[PDB]
DNA sequence: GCATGCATGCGCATGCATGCATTATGCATGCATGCGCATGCATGC
């Protein structure tokens, strides 16, 4: 609401922002300053304020096509012996138009909408769901493992399509539910078994896997300056106005575009992957991951307060999409990950 | 003693306060049950 007004009579703040802006590890400190009392895994923070930012908002009724997501889902799979659940925590206590769910608790009827009847006056028919509710928001899943099929098949859509088709008993509607999704899943066996490959451990299909722009697969190294470091940092736990301005204005003031050194860079990445990921044993690469990467690396733009997004943004966006998978520690034709 | 006056007396009409006779039809509410829906339990393979 306040965003589309021009309530921006700060201009100490607005010089103050735009001189941050031009300095060179606003990014790093953007990602330091998402989360104090959360740990060194700097690359989740980091995609999670992607998330945050978004990609540009393009219209494509014209070409015929339909709507494009224009949003970030993420994926987060690991032990229940980590701290995702605090991220989720955290996140949905950040940002306004926030839901969560958990596993089998909610239907597939639970989402969308359901058929009702007032209590006081006659008629209601229709009510919103979870997941309406959270429309321009963030839908936060936890125990992803959990749910049915049927919450699935709706899914589907949704994660896709950014909208909803309903028809029952006088009741055809459409509805936007252009929200963003994070996820969170656990190893079938609750240990991320070595000896298994990815997708055995992961045990999804590959057509709701695709859709997830980024996959941050959580494992131990059990390192002693890891150990040392949490150790103490947790022990030791016994400008937020200025991040929101900051996250606000670019937000809200500022269209990513890209020339043809980001489109060639975008392609030569896009064959990379599928040479990478032929190989069976790993995740499959499909065309949808393009289009993640064209969305991490707009991102990555409105981060730095560019209109114009550079070979930077790119290579920035491919580095993290290869690190979030650990394609690099993984066995290109085994599919075991190695230290 | 007879002639006259006359206060008493009786029967049928109207006027006026009380009293007497008359009298089914239309609309609302709770019990029984169909029809659409979502959850949930049980049963295979």
Redesign the pocket.
Known sequence: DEEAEQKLFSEKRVELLKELSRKPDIYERLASALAPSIYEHEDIKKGILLQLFGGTRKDFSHTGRGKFRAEINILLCGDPGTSKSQLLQYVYNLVPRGQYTSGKGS????LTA??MKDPETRQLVLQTGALVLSDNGICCIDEFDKMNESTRSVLHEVMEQQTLSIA??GIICQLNARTSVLAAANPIESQWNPKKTTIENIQLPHTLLSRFDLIFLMLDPQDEAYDRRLAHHLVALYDMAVLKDYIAYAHSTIMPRLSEEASQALIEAYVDMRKIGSSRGMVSAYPRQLESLIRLAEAHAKVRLSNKVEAIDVEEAKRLHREALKQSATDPRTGIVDI
């Open positions: 239907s597939a009827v639970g359901y058929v029952k008993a």
